[PDB]
Structure 1
Amino acid sequence: MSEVEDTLNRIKTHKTVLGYLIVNSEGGVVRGAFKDEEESKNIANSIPLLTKKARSVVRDLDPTNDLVFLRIQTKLNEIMVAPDDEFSLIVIQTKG
């Protein structure tokens, strides 16, 4: 298919995006498209724990209602994560 593998190529090519990284449910790197490897390795380990911890937050308040999309916003950067059961998509977009 062109459709997932093209959209993922499109959001990378898109201006003011550092890189898109797919995390496996077992905290593993399927695709990692950042500049420096330290950042990509760091993002691969650190962020999927925040999303699991942030999933337990929304879950406690209402255990029917599951996480569909998490967006953190830092001083310099934004961090946006779209979690699913099979895979999790992560991006880092610099604020305009």
Structure 2
Amino acid sequence: MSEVEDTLNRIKTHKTVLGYLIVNSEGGVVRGAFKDEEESKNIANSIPLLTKKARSVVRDLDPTNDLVFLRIQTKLNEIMVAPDDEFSLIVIQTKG
């Protein structure tokens, strides 16, 4: 298919995006498209724990209602994550 593998190529090519990284449910790197490897390795380990911890937050308040999309916003950067059961998509977009 062109459709997932093209959209993922499109959001990378898109201006003011550092890189898109797919995390496996077992905290593993399927695709990692950042500049420096330290950042990509760091993002691969650190962020999927925040999303699991942030999933337990929304879950406690209402255990029917599951996480569909998490967006953190830092001083310099934004961090946006779209979690699913099979895979999790992560991006880092610099604020305009």
TM-score by length of structure 1 reads 1.00
RMSD: 0.0
Unaligned runs of 5+ residues in structure 2 are none
Per-residue CA shift, 1:21-50, capped at 9, x if unaligned? 000000000000000000000000000000
Deviations 1:3-34 (Å, cap 9, x if unpaired)?
A: 00000000000000000000000000000000
Instruction: Name the residue aligned to 2:22.
Output: 22
* Residue 81 of structure 1, CA deviation: 0.0
Q: Secondary structure at the match of 2:93?
A: strand
Q: When the two structures are aligned, how many residues end up with a matched partner?
A: 96
User: More strand by proportion, 1 or 2?
Assistant: 1
After TM superposition, where is structure 1 displaced by more than 6 Å over at least 4 residues in a row?
A: none
Percent of counterpart pairs with the same letter? 100
Give the Å deviation of 1:62.
0.0
- Give 2:8's aligned residue: 8
